[PDB]
Amino acid sequence: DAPEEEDHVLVLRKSNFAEALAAHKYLLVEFYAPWCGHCKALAPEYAKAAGKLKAEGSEIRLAKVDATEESDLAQQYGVRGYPTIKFFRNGDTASPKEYTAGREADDIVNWLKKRTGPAATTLPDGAAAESLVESSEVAVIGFFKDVESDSAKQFLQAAEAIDDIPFGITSNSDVFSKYQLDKDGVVLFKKFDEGRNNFEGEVTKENLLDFIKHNQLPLVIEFTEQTAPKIFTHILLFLPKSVSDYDGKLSNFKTAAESFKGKILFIFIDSDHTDNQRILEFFGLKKEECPAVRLITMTKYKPESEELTAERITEFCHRFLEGKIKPHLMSQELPEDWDKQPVKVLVGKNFEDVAFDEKKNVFVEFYAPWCGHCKQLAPIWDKLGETYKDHENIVIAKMDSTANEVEAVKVHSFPTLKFFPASADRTVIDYNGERTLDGFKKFLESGGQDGA
């Protein structure tokens, strides 16, 4: 008990950090920089909280790290500013919970108290049992008459290894009978699908974690943009609520999900809704084009037929699982005029065979319409086309890089002028020279070796 510390707050270097991780099962670490104004204000409140845990005889220890002094210890935790407070259970560096609440001593303390102590809540009666289940979407309850058995201990070891799910443990046999159990066992409760799964086999940590990993998550899941992080190989069903046989088609989307669990994540989204737009335009779809299906992995794919049984949606997945389905690239409809004017219009389908034509010197303007800089350049580009309208090898082109995506080259800033020489090796050269007709002409005739 003679370790470096300030006001009951452990001073952590990179030399002792993992030593305090093991010597303290509940370690709250504040990452601060001595110049940070907000780290200054938290400092006496952070220590005030450490003294109050001390007075209660709490085992929870509060520590801090001077990011200017270690620097590599802030790098090793993806720290993105100061103060940064991370909570470590069981010295596990894999799942540190970030503290994001109030920075007064009483806030910090009440936050710790609600997530310290053993990970499995002891259940004496059916009240605490069914409360634990109702308190979360997914809950796991272990049933052990002898709580000292390895099965019980391996269960508690598995409970500590998971934080996203509440764990319960009981020895009361009124509970066993209540939940239809005559012997020891583990039951996973969920508010979806079958609603309940029972564990089978040797009750070990490894087998328990695997049992939970595969039994959480619904078969098909409702898509919300707040769930997008945790959710994201996925198959996305854009299903409107207004449609007929909604339940029937949803059923077909679930039975197909039964054959790909753990490999493909089945997600259905309500297209009729107003919050599923960022994603419905991310795939370049409209409510009218739905019901629709889009599989991804960023590689995205798209089914052949447009109908939604179980067999076709399944084989579609199988077709993707072996090539047999080409990546779907976003691309406009290639207007038949596209090449009937001095400036040839490009889209996603022709691009490669146009731009990378081995007998052509293609000059493409990647653009967008609201881009004032790409409308200040529009008259100069049409003049460049008219100048080279009857040229033999030179072709002047333009593509809307919004509604089109191409694998060959990427563009996200407009306007971007790229030149594709007439060669076999698919060479590309950027034009960063004077945006003038004189500059364009000086650059083309000179092969591209002079300019930019």
From Swiss-Prot:
<dbReference type="GO" id="GO:0032991">
    <property type="term" value="C:protein-containing complex"/>
</dbReference>
<dbReference type="GO" id="GO:0045785">
    <property type="term" value="P:positive regulation of cell adhesion"/>
</dbReference>
<dbReference type="InterPro" id="IPR036249">
    <property type="entry name" value="Thioredoxin-like_sf"/>
</dbReference>
<dbReference type="Pfam" id="PF00085">
    <property type="entry name" value="Thioredoxin"/>
</dbReference>
<feature type="modified residue" description="Phosphoserine">
    <location>
        <position position="401"/>
    </location>
</feature>
<keyword id="KW-0732">Signal</keyword>
<feature type="site" description="Contributes to redox potential value">
    <location>
        <position position="373"/>
    </location>
</feature>
<dbReference type="GO" id="GO:0009897">
    <property type="term" value="C:external side of plasma membrane"/>
</dbReference>
<dbReference type="GO" id="GO:0005576">
    <property type="term" value="C:extracellular region"/>
</dbReference>
<keyword id="KW-0597">Phosphoprotein</keyword>
<dbReference type="GO" id="GO:0034975">
    <property type="term" value="P:protein folding in endoplasmic reticulum"/>
</dbReference>
<keyword id="KW-0989">Craniosynostosis</keyword>
<keyword id="KW-0677">Repeat</keyword>
<dbReference type="GO" id="GO:0034663">
    <property type="term" value="C:endoplasmic reticulum chaperone complex"/>
</dbReference>
<feature type="active site" description="Nucleophile">
    <location>
        <position position="371"/>
    </location>
</feature>
<protein>
    <recommendedName>
        <fullName>Protein disulfide-isomerase</fullName>
        <ecNumber>5.3.4.1</ecNumber>
    </recommendedName>
</protein>
<dbReference type="GO" id="GO:0070062">
    <property type="term" value="C:extracellular exosome"/>
</dbReference>
<dbReference type="GO" id="GO:1902175">
    <property type="term" value="P:regulation of oxidative stress-induced intrinsic apoptotic signaling pathway"/>
</dbReference>
<dbReference type="GO" id="GO:0003779">
    <property type="term" value="F:actin binding"/>
</dbReference>
<dbReference type="InterPro" id="IPR005792">
    <property type="entry name" value="Prot_disulphide_isomerase"/>
</dbReference>
<dbReference type="GO" id="GO:0071456">
    <property type="term" value="P:cellular response to hypoxia"/>
</dbReference>
<keyword id="KW-0007">Acetylation</keyword>
<dbReference type="GO" id="GO:0016972">
    <property type="term" value="F:thiol oxidase activity"/>
</dbReference>
<dbReference type="GO" id="GO:2000406">
    <property type="term" value="P:positive regulation of T cell migration"/>
</dbReference>
<dbReference type="InterPro" id="IPR013766">
    <property type="entry name" value="Thioredoxin_domain"/>
</dbReference>
<dbReference type="GO" id="GO:0038155">
    <property type="term" value="P:interleukin-23-mediated signaling pathway"/>
</dbReference>
<feature type="site" description="Contributes to redox potential value">
    <location>
        <position position="37"/>
    </location>
</feature>
<keyword id="KW-1003">Cell membrane</keyword>
<keyword id="KW-1015">Disulfide bond</keyword>
<dbReference type="GO" id="GO:0006888">
    <property type="term" value="P:endoplasmic reticulum to Golgi vesicle-mediated transport"/>
</dbReference>
<feature type="active site" description="Nucleophile">
    <location>
        <position position="36"/>
    </location>
</feature>
<keyword id="KW-1065">Osteogenesis imperfecta</keyword>
<comment type="similarity">
    <text>Belongs to the protein disulfide isomerase family.</text>
</comment>
<keyword id="KW-0472">Membrane</keyword>
<dbReference type="GO" id="GO:0003723">
    <property type="term" value="F:RNA binding"/>
</dbReference>
<feature type="domain" description="Thioredoxin 2">
    <location>
        <begin position="323"/>
        <end position="449"/>
    </location>
</feature>
<dbReference type="GO" id="GO:0030070">
    <property type="term" value="P:insulin processing"/>
</dbReference>
<dbReference type="GO" id="GO:0016222">
    <property type="term" value="C:procollagen-proline 4-dioxygenase complex"/>
</dbReference>
<comment type="function">
    <text>This multifunctional protein catalyzes the formation, breakage and rearrangement of disulfide bonds. At the cell surface, seems to act as a reductase that cleaves disulfide bonds of proteins attached to the cell. May therefore cause structural modifications of exofacial proteins. Inside the cell, seems to form/rearrange disulfide bonds of nascent proteins. At high concentrations and following phosphorylation by FAM20C, functions as a chaperone that inhibits aggregation of misfolded proteins. At low concentrations, facilitates aggregation (anti-chaperone activity).</text>
</comment>
<keyword id="KW-0256">Endoplasmic reticulum</keyword>
<feature type="site" description="Lowers pKa of C-terminal Cys of first active site">
    <location>
        <position position="103"/>
    </location>
</feature>
<dbReference type="GO" id="GO:0004656">
    <property type="term" value="F:procollagen-proline 4-dioxygenase activity"/>
</dbReference>
